[PDB]
Amino acid sequence: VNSFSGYLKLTDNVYIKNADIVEEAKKVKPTVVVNAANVYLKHGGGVAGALNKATNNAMQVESDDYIATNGPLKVGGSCVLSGHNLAKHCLHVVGPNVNKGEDIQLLKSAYENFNQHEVLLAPLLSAGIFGADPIHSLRVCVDTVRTNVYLAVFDKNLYDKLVSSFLE
Ligand SMILES: CC(C)[C@H](Nc1ncnc2[nH]c(-c3cnn(C)c3C#N)cc12)c1ccc2c(c1)NC(=O)CO2
């Protein structure tokens, strides 16, 4: 149904909210929820672990079957799979992990995957333990994505910092 509510409008197509992406998926029933994935789709921590646990491991079982037959994704790439009980589809997107020395330049390619979907509920790519500067990740999102993106950032201080920085 895509019933998003309580978001701050940053640009004509980018919205942000201080919220857990899992709770937003349950409330919104979006057509697409984005997972902040790794190349072998191992959903142990961060956003991926939170989405997988909310599907009672159904996401991991599906992802393991996909990987066994197709092999790993590339950094900056994506994969559409079932959204299970959270969404119609899950778009698994691999942002670069700069704490593991991956190229930050690939974050544009990661967000470019969103342009295949009219509307998406998504997290901030490459932020948290992936190590990118969260203000830079929001700028790449705004400059790259042309479709409607609703960003859920589950940290009040980080949310207030991104909004404040964007309004400068
Ligand atoms: C920047 C953070 C605010 C963001 N985290 C989140 N953002 C939005 N909804 C969230 N729910 C939870 C949650 C819910 N339950 N649990 C046990 C967790 C956890 N962990 C976490 C979460 C974040 C964390 C790690 C990341 C990425 C983004 N991006 C990447 O590319 C990979 O690494």
Curated annotation (Swiss-Prot):
Where is it located?
Host endoplasmic reticulum membrane
Membrane topology designation: Multi-pass membrane protein
Q: How is its activity regulated?
A: Inhibited in vitro by GRL-0617.
Reactions catalysed:
Thiol-dependent hydrolysis of ester, thioester, amide, peptide and isopeptide bonds formed by the C-terminal Gly of ubiquitin (a 76-residue protein attached to proteins as an intracellular targeting signal)
What is the superkingdom listed in this entry's lineage?
A: Viruses
**Record's signal peptide:** none
Q: Macro domain: from which residue to which, for each copy?
A: 1-168
Q: How does it assemble?
A: May form homohexamers. Interacts with N protein.
Q: What does this protein do?
A: Responsible for the cleavages located at the N-terminus of the replicase polyprotein. Participates together with nsp4 in the assembly of virally-induced cytoplasmic double-membrane vesicles necessary for viral replication. Antagonizes innate immune induction of type I interferon by blocking the phosphorylation, dimerization and subsequent nuclear translocation of host IRF3. Also prevents host NF-kappa-B signaling. In addition, PL-PRO possesses a deubiquitinating/deISGylating activity and processes both 'Lys-48'- and 'Lys-63'-linked polyubiquitin chains from cellular substrates.
Q: What is this protein called?
A: Papain-like protease nsp3
- Give the shown range, full length included: 1025 to 1192 of 7096
